[PDB]
Amino acid sequence: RAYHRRVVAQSKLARERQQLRAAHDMLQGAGHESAALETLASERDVSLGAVERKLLAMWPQMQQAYSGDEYVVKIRDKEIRTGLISTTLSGTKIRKVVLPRFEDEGEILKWLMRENVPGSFPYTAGVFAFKREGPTRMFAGEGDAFRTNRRFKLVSE
Amino acid sequence: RGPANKVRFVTAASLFDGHDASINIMRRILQSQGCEVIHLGHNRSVQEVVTAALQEDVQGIAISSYQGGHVEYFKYMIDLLREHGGEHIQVFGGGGGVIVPDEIRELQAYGVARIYSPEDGQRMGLAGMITDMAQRCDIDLTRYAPTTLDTVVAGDRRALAQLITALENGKADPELVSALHAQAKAAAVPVLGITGTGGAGKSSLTDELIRRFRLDQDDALSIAVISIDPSRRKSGGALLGDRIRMNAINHPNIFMRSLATREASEISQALPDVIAACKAARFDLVIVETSGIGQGDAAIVPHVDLSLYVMTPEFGAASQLEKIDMLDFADFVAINKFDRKGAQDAWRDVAKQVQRNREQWHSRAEDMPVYGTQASRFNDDGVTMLYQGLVGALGARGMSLKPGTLPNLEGRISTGQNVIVPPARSRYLAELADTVRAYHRRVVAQSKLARERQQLRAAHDMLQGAGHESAALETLASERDVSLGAVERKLLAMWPQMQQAYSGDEYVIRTGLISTTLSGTKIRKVVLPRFEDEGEILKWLMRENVPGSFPYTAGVFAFKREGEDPTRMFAGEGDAFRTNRRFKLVSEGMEAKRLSTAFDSVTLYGEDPHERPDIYGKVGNSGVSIATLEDMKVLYDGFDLTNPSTSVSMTINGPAPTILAMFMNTAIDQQIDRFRADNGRDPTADEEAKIRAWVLQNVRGTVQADILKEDQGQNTCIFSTEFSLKVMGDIQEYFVHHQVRNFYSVSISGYHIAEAGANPISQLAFTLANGFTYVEAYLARGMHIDDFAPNLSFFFSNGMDPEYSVLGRVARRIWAVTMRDKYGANDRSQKLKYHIQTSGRSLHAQEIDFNDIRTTLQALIAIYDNCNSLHTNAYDEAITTPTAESVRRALAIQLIINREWGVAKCENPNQGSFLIEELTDLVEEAVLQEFERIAERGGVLGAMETGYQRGKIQEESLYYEQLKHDGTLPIIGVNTFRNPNGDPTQTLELARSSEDEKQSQLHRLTEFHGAHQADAEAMLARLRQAVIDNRNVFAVLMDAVRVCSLGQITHALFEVGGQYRRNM
Amino acid sequence: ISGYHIAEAGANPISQLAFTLANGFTYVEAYLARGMHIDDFAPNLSFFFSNGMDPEYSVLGRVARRIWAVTMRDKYGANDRSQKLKYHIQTSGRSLHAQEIDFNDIRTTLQALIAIYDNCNSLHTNAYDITTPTAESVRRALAIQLIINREWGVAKCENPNQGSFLIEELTDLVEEAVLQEFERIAERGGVLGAMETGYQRGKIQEESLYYEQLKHDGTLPIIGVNTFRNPNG
Ligand code: B12
Ligand SMILES: CCCC(=O)SCCNC(=O)CCNC(=O)[C@H](O)C(C)(C)COP(=O)(O)OP(=O)(O)OC[C@H]1O[C@@H](n2cnc3c(N)ncnc32)[C@H](O)[C@@H]1OP(=O)(O)O
Ligand SMILES: Nc1nc2c(ncn2[C@@H]2O[C@H](COP(=O)(O)OP(=O)(O)O)[C@@H](O)[C@H]2O)c(=O)[nH]1
Ligand SMILES: C[C@H]1O[C@@H](n2cnc3c(N)ncnc32)[C@H](O)[C@@H]1O
Ligand SMILES: [Mg+2]
Ligand SMILES: [Mg+2]
């Protein structure tokens, strides 16, 4: 419950912060240069937590990742490319992981904290990035140890 | 290299069978392997196929029979072939799961070469089957050719057909050849050559001219037709597609042979030999059709006595006519497709050009042998005019003919002033595409405004909370209040009030919102978004409002019906008595009676049941056999059709107006009987009039009748396309006049288009396009958009493809937006209601238990996406009509989802989903682009003219099927995860028709006929006069079905409405 | 840590999920009080749930993952491997009946679907049959997963649940419902203190009876059992 209270508060902050800087850019586009807005904006940069600030910051980079046809990620000294697209008979590109198209940074942060993509805290949509491709266990147990073993050896041949 | 010999095939679908998806992908592999294929198309009797194969002198026959009655059908064919010198011709068949293994062994033992099961297709592969089929027919037929002309000259048409196969292959003796030409010279028979540009209508015009010859001369003339189509030298074989357009050649005095060019030329290298062969066979007239010739091509001229150049009004500039060699030699010129734009100006250019080429300056340009014809139009006066001219010319050229019985009219130009869609509105589909895209552009702009407006006032409130009051922000805010539209401003304003409505436990006229689980969780019927951004709110409210609000993306109604579930099970087997049992079986335990009627192949083609094995074997199979009004009454006995909780969905296309008239008469007669019982007396003339009128208004149900999809998808069109559309409008006009506000005049469908092989995008696009065509058709016909649009029903298919998940919601939005913005119709018209039926092709004969899994998933996304009506397929889908046990499993799928399934307690679970919204957008745009592709082909009608839809469907069908056998596209139990046993479905129970039931229908028919034997001829005459005098056809049908059978009515209309011309 | 038997005994999805997470947390507290480190046993902890027809089952796994991840990070300060809750889902066997056994494949399909949608780690599918597990019956059960994973179109997407207004609201509701149940067990002396009173056993038995009641009541429709019954058998 405490975590969710934080999501609400941090969202309101991230939302207000965007609303301010948005109005600031619109005023300068009309001529009026009121930095009084910026003072309230910078005030909410500190109000936002460290983790929350980095979440929103990585969001545009996050979008470009799940956008393409592949997912390039380098572990150790090599790399691990993963396909994102599965194409239908009609020729439609079905993305493995579909990202939200919110403009409100309040909704973005709210979503990133409550239900991040698969493979990211709090792992709501899954604990792994992408599902494993290709896992059926072989259950056997009857009679004495000899019969159960044979069934094991037979199935797992 | 292809085959060793010149291998020829005759391919067709069985009698009253529309299933061409199978047979079409076979004639494609046949052609590619190097076989000349004479394709006959769908709906072919044994008499038709056998006559064809015998005249063409082919090695093999390929038939697809999915309607059943195949055992009787193929036996008839085998018998008929042996009886008329065709024992050596091998017959091949296929019907998927319909033809059970026992019947295959029986038919193959009877004489059929091979019949392929779906399991055969898997093992052998698509190419493997055709290879096996071709290798069998790789034989030399020249050994059967006559050595002397004795047989041929005597009148033997079979010997003639074989002599041609000898002459064509050059295996004919030189002394025989010269002896043939010698007698051909002394024969002195006229030879009419018909050449022209590709697809101008050479075949269609030829058929019509022959029909004129038959009507005018009482079938006294013996006509020989030699049609030539171009051959692809790559494969080796060709697609001889001229015979498929010929409907008037089915007669003993008519003979037709299809020849491939067998060169890069527009005439067969042995054409003079073939012509001479027909001349010696004592024919009264020989007609020769060439292939698509260019501007500077005219090789038909030296081989014929008279030449006819066929063209379309589309020839570009008027200077182009000076480049056409054929305009310099042609004795007659026929400007076909005179319904097209600029036909009159086309005639005045061509006429003046022919006048110049002949240097007849002392004559009038209007006197030149240039004719304006419309072969597509039944009994076209233009074509008749051309005929009269050809007669006069053939008469002077030594051809005895009796004084004609046809209207010896005067003029050179057709007066066919009928139009379905005016050329001014030709690009209607493209406009609709623009309308939708324009709407979305507005959503983007209005969102940005609403977003900015909020951001400003938000910052304004935060500044005043800190002290610094800057009214400069407010100036920009008030600036965007005006920028926002009136409708958009009210949308956001009602949003907080909207939230409070769907928040509580009731919707205040009060409706419950909450369904509580066993765990005690409150599952709201409609879940609203929790956005803070007013930009997202407005964006959502404009793109996907709640169910029951524009653009009705999540449904056209606020909440799903309380008692009447969307369930509506397709049914039909045996006679009207047995089906009436199945209706009561499905609708048992349901207060709301939702019936869905399936008719047998014979009724679907407007024919009466008959003793001939062609027809008899199909009676009561694949659907209920309905032939008379009395059958229709029995069908719905015990069902109050005028009851508000009872709706009937008849699936009928070609004879739909006739069947509808039977249904209406039944619904009326029910209330007349109900009155006679509640008062113990017959209603007075005034009382009955009030009753009859009331029935028409409140009767609830749906008739399919979508003819646009018939040409494109289902092939149940019996009359000419233009005639069917004419009568369809008559129905809608009848409905408007009598205020039939509950019955749906047409179920604009795409299920059939999809089952033929079209992917979800093509299905949805074509179907909406067809629907919009009807709209444009009725609008150009003088009906208010709000008068017919609420009566428009839709029908779709749900398969496994991802797009099917959002098919319905896309259809609803595209309709709602266009109906509002483009056509300016009211709310009732913006609401697209549709029926979804699970994909039948997605179910297989192998491991039939797996089909219930697929049918479940498909049923799910239909209910999720808030469909209006749902049909569920049985597990034995591939093999038989749903059994008693089988229909309950199919019926349970809906019952379990609706009642047991937890997520289903929510009515908009799709909404919000990132995948669903993105897919909805993608599919929508994909459809719009397809609209534009059809629009640049002359609209839906203009595209059908080219066979664009049919071409695109059959291509996609092949692409899918190539992958099914391939393995690239996994199908569990078919191409992967096979059974270690290898048994596709022991002995399963089948839904065939009783012998007694067939005899019952025959006896009931002959009894009905005897009852109204007096008024029969008189009524049918009135019906034809209704077409001639161009009155309302359906209005007469409302009386006609009382004294006439289905067959009588259909065949009567054939004399005055024409028959459908197949389109490959 | 299992919760299959708890649900199979009659517990509704809320009770099942709550008790199971509570049991898991008990093991955590148990191992911690032996002076052990949280990153040493938490990655080895596996879970085992049931998927029935109830609406809550659609979001059961995602709720379990979030409650675990948040608590393991904030409360116990464990690492990433420990915050990740892996679980096996097995379709409800109770939900399948002896009457009209062909209908069971329909229910088992729907239950298998929401498991895969909600990105489960391991899935078992129940046969249509009552009788012995025949090799034919197990193939129909095994085909359900094969068809969804390979043939089903929506399944090509790995997060189709995300975004859905219903799913997100249900996720929140179930989560809080579980938390309240934690508090009910906590005020009974923890899981062990509750077992001392037979609180879980009592509550499960109470819910099993309530289900079995509405079933007989005709209030909770079961196709082929209390409605749409076989006209021949
Ligand atoms: C697609 C389809 C339709 C489409 C037709 C589209 C079209 N243009 O062809 C639509 C939706 C229009 C339709 C309508 C109807 N259909 Co239908 N349809 C089907 C369906 C789903 C598949 C048939 C198909 O095309 N399969 C694709 C082919 C390529 O594959 P296959 O059949 O497995 O064939 C293989 C081998 O056998 C071999 N083979 C097959 N034929 C041939 C031919 C040759 C020459 C060769 C060499 C090989 C070969 O090639 C394939 C290799 O894999 C079947 C059910 C099913 N899935 O079996 C019902 C089915 C055939 N139809 C049926 C019925 C009843 C109808 C209707 C009459 C219903 C009605 N009462 O209104 C209507 C009207 C038809 C008409 N127009 O006259 C019933 C038949 C019942 C019976 N005969 O006992 C079926 C079995 C469905 C059912 N269980 O109710 N249909
Ligand atoms: C041969 C190859 C295989 C095939 O082709 S099989 C072909 C199978 N085809 C079919 O079964 C087609 C079935 N479809 C139809 O009959 C129609 O398209 C249709 C519209 C779905 C019929 O559904 P119905 O149940 O009759 O619905 P309806 O719109 O006519 O409703 C009648 C009036 O009742 C009210 N109503 C219905 N649903 C409501 C709701 N949810 N909330 C509030 N009011 C509602 C409403 O007043 C409506 O009338 P209106 O809207 O005032 O005009
Ligand atoms: N709009 C229109 N189409 C026609 C007319 N006559 C024939 N067609 C169509 O043109 C197409 C090709 O006809 P076809 O006889 O095969 O031409 P051919 O291959 O050159 O001999 C078919 O779709 C016909 O229905 C006509 O008078 N008007
Ligand atoms: C075209 C589709 O229509 C359905 N269909 C065709 N005929 C019947 C019938 N008599 N009963 C039920 N469903 C039928 C099948 O599901 C088929 O695949
Ligand atoms: Mg032609
Ligand atoms: Mg031609």
UniProtKB/Swiss-Prot annotation, chain B:
Family: Belongs to the IcmF family.
InterPro entries linked to this entry: Acid_CoA_mut_C, Cbl-dep_enz_cat, Cobalamin-bd, Cobalamin-bd_sf, GTPase/Isobutyryl-CoA_mutase, IcmF, IcmF/GTPase_domain, MeMalonylCoA_mutase_a/b_cat
Function: Catalyzes the reversible interconversion of isobutyryl-CoA and n-butyryl-CoA, and to a much lesser extent, of pivalyl-CoA and isovaleryl-CoA, using radical chemistry. Also exhibits GTPase activity, associated with its G-protein domain (MeaI) that functions as a chaperone that assists cofactor delivery and proper holo-enzyme assembly. The G-domain of IcmF also has a role in its cofactor repair. Does not display ATPase activity.
Protein species of origin: Cupriavidus metallidurans (strain ATCC 43123 / DSM 2839 / NBRC 102507 / CH34) (Ralstonia metallidurans)
Residue sites binding Mg(2+) 2 per the record: 228-229, 242, 289-290
Residue numbers binding adenosylcob(III)alamin: 19
GO biological process: acyl-CoA metabolic process
Entry-linked PANTHER family: LAO_AO TRANSPORT SYSTEM ATPASE, LYSINE/ARGININE/ORNITHINE TRANSPORT SYSTEM KINASE
An example molecular function term from Gene Ontology annotations: GTP binding
Modes of activity regulation: Is prone to inactivation during catalytic turnover due to the occasional loss of the 5'-deoxyadenosine moiety and formation of the inactive cob(II)alamin cofactor in its active site. The GTPase activity of IcmF powers the ejection of the inactive cofactor and requires the presence of an acceptor protein, adenosyltransferase (ATR), for receiving it. ATR, in turn, catalyzes an adenosylation reaction converting cob(II)alamin in the presence of ATP and a reductant to the active AdoCbl cofactor. The repaired cofactor is then reloaded onto IcmF in a GTPase-gated step, regenerating active enzyme.
Record: residues binding Mg(2+) 1: 203, 242, 289
Gene: icmF
Effect of residue 570 to A: Switches the substrate specificity and enhances the catalytic efficiency of the isovaleryl-CoA mutase over the native isobutyryl-CoA mutase activity about 4000-fold. Is even more susceptible to inactivation than wild-type during turnover
Residues the entry annotates as binding GTP: 199-204, 245, 336-339, 945, 1063
NCBIfam families xrefs: acid_CoA_mut_C, acid_CoA_mut_N, IsobCoAmut_IcmF
Keywords: Chaperone, Cobalamin, Cobalt, GTP-binding, Hydrolase, Isomerase, Magnesium, Metal-binding, Multifunctional enzyme, Nucleotide-binding
Binding site for substrate: 559, 594, 700, 744, 793, 828, 833
EC assignment: 5.4.99.13, 3.6.5.-
Signal peptide: none
Pfam family, one: B12-binding
Region of interest: Linker: 397-551
Catalytic activity: 2-methylpropanoyl-CoA = butanoyl-CoA; 3-methylbutanoyl-CoA = 2,2-dimethylpropanoyl-CoA; GTP + H2O = GDP + phosphate + H(+)
Annotated HAMAP family: IcmF
Protein name from the UniProt record: Fused isobutyryl-CoA mutase
